[PDB]
Amino acid sequence: EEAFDIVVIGAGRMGAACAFYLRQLAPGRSLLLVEEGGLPNEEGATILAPGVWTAQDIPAGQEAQAEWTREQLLGALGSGKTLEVEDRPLLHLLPAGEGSGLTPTLDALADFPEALALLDPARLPVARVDPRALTYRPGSLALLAAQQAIGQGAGLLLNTRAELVPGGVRLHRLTVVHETRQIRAGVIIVAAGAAGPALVEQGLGLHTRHGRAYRQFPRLDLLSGAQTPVLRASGLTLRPQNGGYTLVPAIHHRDPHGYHPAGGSLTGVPTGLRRELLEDLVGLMDAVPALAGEGLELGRSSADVPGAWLALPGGRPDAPPQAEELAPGLHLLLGGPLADTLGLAAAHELAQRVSASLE
Amino acid sequence: EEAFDIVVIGAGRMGAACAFYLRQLAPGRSLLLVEEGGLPNEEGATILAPGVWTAQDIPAGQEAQAEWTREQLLGALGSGKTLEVEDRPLLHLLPAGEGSGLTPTLDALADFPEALALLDPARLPVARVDPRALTYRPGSLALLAAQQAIGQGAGLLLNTRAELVPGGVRLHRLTVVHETRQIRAGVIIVAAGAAGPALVEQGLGLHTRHGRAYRQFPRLDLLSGAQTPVLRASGLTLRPQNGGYTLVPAIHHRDPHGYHPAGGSLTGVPTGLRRELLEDLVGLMDAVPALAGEGLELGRSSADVPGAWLALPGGRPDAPPQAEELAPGLHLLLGGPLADTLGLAAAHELAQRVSASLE
Ligand SMILES: Nc1ncnc2c1ncn2[C@@H]1O[C@H](COP(=O)(O)OP(=O)(O)O)[C@@H](O)[C@H]1O
Numbered sequence: 001e002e003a004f005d006i007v008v009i010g011a012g013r014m015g016a017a018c019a020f021y022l023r024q025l026a027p028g029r030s031l032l033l034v035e036e037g038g039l040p041n042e043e044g045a046t047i048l049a050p051g052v053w054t055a056q057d058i059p060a061g062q063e064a065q066a067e068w069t070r071e072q073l074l075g076a077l078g079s080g081k082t083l084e085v086e087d088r089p090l091l092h093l094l095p096a097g098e099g100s101g102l103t104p105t106l107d108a109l110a111d112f113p114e115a116l117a118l119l120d121p122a123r124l125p126v127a128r129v130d131p132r133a134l135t136y137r138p139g140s141l142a143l144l145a146a147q148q149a150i151g152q153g154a155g156l157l158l159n160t161r162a163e164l165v166p167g168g169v170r171l172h173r174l175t176v177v178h179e180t181r182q183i184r185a186g187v188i189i190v191a192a193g194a195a196g197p198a199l200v201e202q203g204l205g206l207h208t209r210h211g212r213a214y215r216q217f218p219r220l221d222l223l224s225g226a227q228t229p230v231l232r233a234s235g236l237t238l239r240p241q242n243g244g245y246t247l248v249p250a251i252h253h254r255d256p257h258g259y260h261p262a263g264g265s266l267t268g269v270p271t272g273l274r275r276e277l278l279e280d281l282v283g284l285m286d287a288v289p290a291l292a293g294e295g296l297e298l299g300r301s302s303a304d305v306p307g308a309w310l311a312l313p314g315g316r317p318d319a320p321p322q323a324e325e326l327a328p329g330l331h332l333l334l335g336g337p338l339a340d341t342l343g344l345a346a347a348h349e350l351a352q353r354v355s356a357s358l359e
Numbered sequence: 360e361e362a363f364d365i366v367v368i369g370a371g372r373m374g375a376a377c378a379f380y381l382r383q384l385a386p387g388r389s390l391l392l393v394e395e396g397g398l399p400n401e402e403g404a405t406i407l408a409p410g411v412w413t414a415q416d417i418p419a420g421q422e423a424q425a426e427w428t429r430e431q432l433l434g435a436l437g438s439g440k441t442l443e444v445e446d447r448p449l450l451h452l453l454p455a456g457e458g459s460g461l462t463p464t465l466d467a468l469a470d471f472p473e474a475l476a477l478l479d480p481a482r483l484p485v486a487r488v489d490p491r492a493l494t495y496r497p498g499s500l501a502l503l504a505a506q507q508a509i510g511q512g513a514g515l516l517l518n519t520r521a522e523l524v525p526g527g528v529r530l531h532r533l534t535v536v537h538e539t540r541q542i543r544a545g546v547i548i549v550a551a552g553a554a555g556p557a558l559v560e561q562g563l564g565l566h567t568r569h570g571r572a573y574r575q576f577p578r579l580d581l582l583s584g585a586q587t588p589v590l591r592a593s594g595l596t597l598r599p600q601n602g603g604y605t606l607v608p609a610i611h612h613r614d615p616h617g618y619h620p621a622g623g624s625l626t627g628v629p630t631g632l633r634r635e636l637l638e639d640l641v642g643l644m645d646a647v648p649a650l651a652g653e654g655l656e657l658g659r660s661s662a663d664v665p666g667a668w669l670a671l672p673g674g675r676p677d678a679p680p681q682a683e684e685l686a687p688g689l690h691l692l693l694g695g696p697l698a699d700t701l702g703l704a705a706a707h708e709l710a711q712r713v714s715a716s717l718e
């Protein structure tokens with residue numbers, strides 16, 4: 001039936017960015033953007049991502065991708081548009097102070113008292129400061145990218161679930177009855193986030209080693225400022241936002257295929273946080289007293305706690321964003337836990353390659 | 360709950376254009392575009408509209424609106440974008456030749472033989488030529504407008520039915536279960552096309568005299584060119600397109616509230632055309648033999664024939680596009696049978712007024 005040169009599945013930060021770069025790299029190549037949710041999609045990972053760009057999230061060898069992504073952020077993708085991005089130093093609080101060029105927490109939080117009251121200076125005396133860290137809303141980044149892509153002639157299909165079939169895509173909708181509709185495509189970019197691996201598996205039998213982890217983002221209602229630095233401890237992050245802090249748990253491991261997030265087992269009372277997060281908090285309460293006061297919103301059940309599924313490339317919690325061609329014309333785009341520092345770069349790199357194999 | 364300064368209901372040619380002009384006139388005023396179909400929507404009137412701009416469709420006093428709309432068309436709304444628009448003269452074939460500055464069909468179709476074989480020069484000797492007529496695809500116009508509006512920060516909501524409530528809008532969706540969601544709005548533009556009058560009636564008890572007519576656009580598979588002029592006879596139009604002609608029936612009157620298009624009663628055989636169109640054809644077959652040959656696609660039932668509902672302002676088949684504020688902050692935007700010559704103008708006029716009352 002109808003056909004497109006390029007079909008991008010997924011309108012989150014990754015797919016939206018990739019569709020944008022492809023519209024500027026290959027404007028003569030028709031592109032269709034398919035998203036099963038809306039635009040934006042508050043049921044996705046991109047919306048809850050803390051949006052922290054930090055030199056501490058750059059794996060060895062990825063300095064080029066990290067800086068290019070940073071430049072894009074401050075330049076709003078070079079679209080003459082507005083993208084709220086503030087300069088906010090990031091501190092990696094540490095116990096026994098001894099090693100590389102660290103900084104005494106006492107001095108680091110000199111003009112930031114609202115961040116001091118959260119911890120215990122004695123149990124976290126030193127830190128690794130990153131003066132170039134930045135904060136932004138991934139949701140705004142993604143929307144901006146989608147908008148610009150659409151303003152550039154990108155086909156748009158929302159509230160549509162894409163299914164991969166040999167040669168093209170099958171689109172499912174709802175009018176009440178289903179509406180299946182196939183379409184040919186020369187190139188298909190799978191930017192379904194954490195759902196990307198399964199998509200290609202159940203659709204084309206293409207096996208991968210990628211995994212997925214469910215991460216919650218409970219809020220900490222304690223005084224915060226527009227310039228109060230991002231803080232990290234034992235892998236946990238305190239992202240100042242909306243006058244408070246958003247707690248970004250560490251991912252210790254991938255979650256199994258058959259797993260339903262439940263959480264709730266704190267000192268004899270059922271909460272909305274997973275057992276693992278609960279344990280982490282208990283282990284950080286002394287160092288970060290704020291985790292033991294009235295600030296943290298624990299909720300009653302997992303339903304009251306903001307959460308999302310993030311892809312884990314290769315199943316590694318610390319693996320960066322990446323792309324790969326699993327078959328002729330078929331690419332799998334993965335963002336992941338480091339997408340805030342390396343996300344755009346991986347979408348642009350994929351766009352360049354796709355654009356070339358078309359010229 | 361959540362609120363917007365401006366909410367535009369309907370993403371067809373009218374709503375899409377209005378949302379575009381509002382984004383440029385009042386960029387600082389948030390705007391949400393709601394459409395129950397997709398983008399584009401091939402289930403709307405805009406998609407089937409012949410897109411004919413002709414000085415013969417300008418009612419007295421509407422010359423300013425007509426020319427402004429024409430300028431927008433050739434300039435693609437001034438968006439530096441591409442909008443296919445060709446120069447195509449329009450001929451209003453007439454019987455007894457005698458009156459204003461007419462032109463002998465024989466000379467008018469001098470270099471256009473493929474248009475001559477459709478009629479009988481004797482029964483239609485003279486015509487009223489319009490050298491400034493233009494043809495374009497309303498669908499492309501609308502999409503372009505929506506795209507540009509989105510690239511300008513216009514909120515977008517598709518596959519969502521809007522319902523007017525005191526103060527704001529109620530949004531219905533489908534995930535399988537319904538999802539009602541209200542939103543406050545300072546200004547609400549009702550660009551639901553033919554469904555606009557009922558919308559406000561069943562939602563706010565606001566009575567109007569506007570009507571609706573169902574018009575079909577059967578195709579005539581006979582030789583056509585990129586420069587073959589648009590032809591009209593006894594109110595019927597032959598719009599050259601895709602190597603053929605699209606038949607644009609005349610609207611003699613409005614269709615009643617409880618009316619289901621059926622059609623099909625030609626010389627003892629059931630077809631897909633309404634009785635009225637059938638009669639018109641019979642009355643034009645002599646003058647336009649092409650209507651009696653193998654060219655016309657009659658179909659078996661109305662389901663096989665391209666059709667759409669068009670609003671009739673004031674219930675008058677020949678009334679132009681218009682807007683009105685039926686209540687504080689509530690506007691009803693109507694396109695209609697003359698939207699190809701006056702549509703943009705009415706959407707821009709409404710945008711200016713809405714923008715001013717906000718400033
Ligand atoms: N099979 C599917 N068909 C269409 N769209 C999909 C499908 N599965 C997921 N999506 C969309 O893919 C998008 C990616 O969002 P997200 O998880 O944030 O990706 P990422 O974080 O990698 O940018 C999601 O927003 C989701 O709405």
Ligand SMILES: Nc1ncnc2c1ncn2[C@@H]1O[C@H](COP(=O)(O)OP(=O)(O)O)[C@@H](O)[C@H]1O
Binds near residue numbers: 521522553
């Ligand atoms: N109540 C509704 N809620 C949301 N969208 C609507 C509703 N009713 C109609 N629409 C949309 O309003 C749009 C107008 O399309 P159209 O009929 O071509 O308007 P017009 O011809 O005046 O530009 C339609 O495309 C339709 O999809």
